[PDB]
Structure formats: C-alpha cells, structure tokens
Amino acid sequence: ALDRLEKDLFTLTEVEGIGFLTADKLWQARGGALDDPRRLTAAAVYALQLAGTQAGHSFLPRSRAEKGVVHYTRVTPGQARLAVETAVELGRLSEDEGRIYLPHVLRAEKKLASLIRTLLATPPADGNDDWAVPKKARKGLSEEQASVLDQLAGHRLVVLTGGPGTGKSTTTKAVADLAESLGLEVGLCAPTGKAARRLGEVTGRTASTVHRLLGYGPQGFRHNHLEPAPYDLLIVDEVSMMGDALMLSLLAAVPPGARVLLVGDTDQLPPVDAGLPLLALAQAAPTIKLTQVYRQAAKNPIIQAAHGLLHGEAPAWGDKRLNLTEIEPDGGARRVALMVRELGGPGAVQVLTPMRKGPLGMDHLNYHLQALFNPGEGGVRIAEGEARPGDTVVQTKNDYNNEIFNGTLGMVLKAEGARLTVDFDGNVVELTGAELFNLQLGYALTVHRAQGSEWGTVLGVLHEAHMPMLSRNLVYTALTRARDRFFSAGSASAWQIAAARQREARNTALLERIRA
C-alpha cells in the first residue's frame, strides 16, 4: 500500500475519511513544495469535490476548475492548467472548454440518465398491467390531482410538481389506495426523517427515509439491481431534496416493470448533495402540475408574499397574518420564546430557524423555549441540553430496538436519574445511555427538516446571523409552511437579502443525456 504513498503522498485526497486539506498540511509540515505537481493534481480533484459540496455542481468547465484551484490553493494561473491537465490524464478527473468531473460522478450521471431512459420507454408490468381508475378512486381529488391516477397507467415514471400547498403529498394517499386495490405493493419514502414521517401521516401508511427503504448497510444499500426493493409502486415525496447519487441509488433498485412516482417542488430546498435530478425529470418525464393552493385560505397575504419571494421581493409585513418583529441575536431567543407564549405556547405555533448553532439557532431557541414553558428539575441529558417530563422530543437517529425512527415526535413521560421514558405516538418506551443521543428537544426546528410539514401558525426566525443560509428557496420554504399565520422574528433586511439571493444553478448534464 504505502508504495503508493511514498510515490505520492496526496493519494488520500480522494480516500476514505481524510481529504486533500489534511494531506496538505501533513505535506507542508513534512517538507513539501506548494508548487509540487503531485499537490496540484490533488488540488484539482479537491476543487471539483468542493464544487459539488459547496455549490452542488456535477461538473466544472475547464476554466472554472482552473480558477477554483487558484482560490482553494494559490499557485499561478498557468500552473493550474497543468494541475487540471495532469489530473485529467492521470485519470483523477474526467473530461466530457470541456466539462470536467470527478471520475465516478460522470459515470453516475451517465448511468442515471440511462436508468431514467429505460424507465421512460418501458411499460409497467410484472406483461402484466391492469391499472384502471375506478370513479371512487378520484373522490376528493381535484381534476389535476386525479389526472395523476390516469398518468400512472401506461407510464413507469411520473413526476408530480406544483408549488407548496397545492396538495401533491395529499394526492399520494389516493395513488397508494388505488395501487393497493389493484393488489400492488407500495413503498413510501422521502429524503428527510420528518418528511417521511409526514408522508406516512397524510398517507395513513408506513413510510421511511429513502435510506431505510433501500436498506442502508456497511456494504452500501441493500437494494439495487441484484436485489430490487420489493415494491410495484414507489412513491417518493420531497424529491427536490434528492441529489443525483441518491436518485441513482433509488432508481437502480426499482423492480423492472415497476412504477415510480416522484413528487416535489424545485422551488423549495435543493439537496445537500450534488445535482438536482428533479429539475431534469420534471421536463423529461410525464408530469402533472398542481396549481390550486389549498394550504392557505384564498388571498391570504402569505400566498402573495410567497409569489413575491419567487421574484426577489421581500414580504410586505404588517398584516395580522403576515408580520415581523425586529430582534437582535443578543437576548433574541428569549424574545422569540415570549412571542410564542403570546401566541398560545409551543403547541399553537411552530418555530423555525435556518441553522442549528448560534444565538438564533435551533439549539439555543430550544433552550429558551424549554426554560420558558417547562422550567425546572435538571432531567436526563440528551443530544443538546436535557429532557424533563412534559418536554416535546424529536427522534433524530434510527433506533431499531424500540423501532423509533428519525423524525418521530415524542412526549417525555418522566425523567428519573438516567432513565428517560418517552411516549412516541403511543409507543411508550424507556431510554438509557447511548440511545439518549438519538433525540433532541422539539420546540424549534430547522427549515430543512420542516419541508413537508405544515402548521397553522409558524414563527420563522430569520436574521443576518443566518447569513450563510439566506437563500430564496430557504425562505420561500419557511414562509409556505404556514396555513393561517406566519410571524417572523429577526430583521426585515434579512428577508430582502434572502429573497434577492438565488443560489446559483447547478451544473448538470442529466437532462441532456436523457434527451440526447
């Protein structure tokens, strides 16, 4: 092994665990020439990895890559070309101002388009297909919503989009009911734990994260082409939070002839990983677009403000249903908590924040919310802070023993010593030790895990202290979680900033590959 490492130390730049950054300091602290070609070629790989990590790009034009090397390194804009070029021919980077990718990402994008291709050209079957829509099946649905039921007939891949609150996820209960009546096995999942949880609620069925559906293991996902996921119909919600990699993994596990229904809105939150497949799919596959808003009552300021965010314009606060109260990070959380009390308490208003840490982060908001509505008796320590009877808790990690999965809300029944017994939707259970780090207080929530949920009145904390997270989709997503009233706490300028900042488009050739 280290024969490889003595020849080139920057062999870890793309190795498990450690990355370029670490191997770089371990290279400078032990001699190492910042201009050394072995460091440059590695620096180029790091540039692309970072391109996907920070901006979600699947590739970078040769130029932007050389430029990215200069910013994440520091050599001469001429040496960079040699860095990229060396990495290219060394096979550390692939090309196709060619488009350069991390080798596996090009393969990934090519196999993904391929999978989508066959999904779009093959008929659903087991040549076995009795999909038929009984009238009772479109009961309660709108014309547009019902059309999805018809579309799944004769098509293996169907996309269901529409802005927030148009009843996409709701349409899903009907689709699943139909499927079951036809004797088909239905699998339900979403990218985040809480979203999967809500998909389950509105569907009346068991749903999980895309990771648990595929059976995540040490060797990777259990389900794939050799052992497809056991479902005839696959329903995936909140698909805009799915990156290329996960999408590839899910599609590759779809039983041949089986159906896949993707539902989501690209105007909401983009994936944390690279890519944004839903954008391509919503244009290549048969899609039905819902347009009637049901979440908020017709002509509620919220709806108009949401339309404003899509055009870089902040909300016109003032209304009893759309207001903002200025606050600073200093003594901010305390204020937010008092605003909550003034609104009926934690149970009458959901608090949302863009980040977990910081004076206005989820962790500190929780503390003040806990201190204000459930003051007292030093209970059992958990993820952050402690839990005391009466506290609302959120499962954040999967617990197979008791079968409490990421995204489940619970109520602390009692905290005795180091034994925290909680009630997770009827499933009363006792937690001790390690399993205590599987949950956090649930008074405050991040916007990312809020996607897919709705509440009557929402209180979103948005302020300059959230700078890195001030994007248009983020606030559009936060604002639209509200059914009746949306109050904001922070600064009006934060919203102006957020509305004007649309994260840059993600370099992707998925659509091109599907069509070409």
Next chain:
DNA sequence: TTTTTTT
C-alpha cells in the same frame, strides 16, 4: 459555512 442521510 451550512443544510441531510447513516445497522
């Protein structure tokens, strides 16, 4: 600099 998933 930050968001998620993870037997």
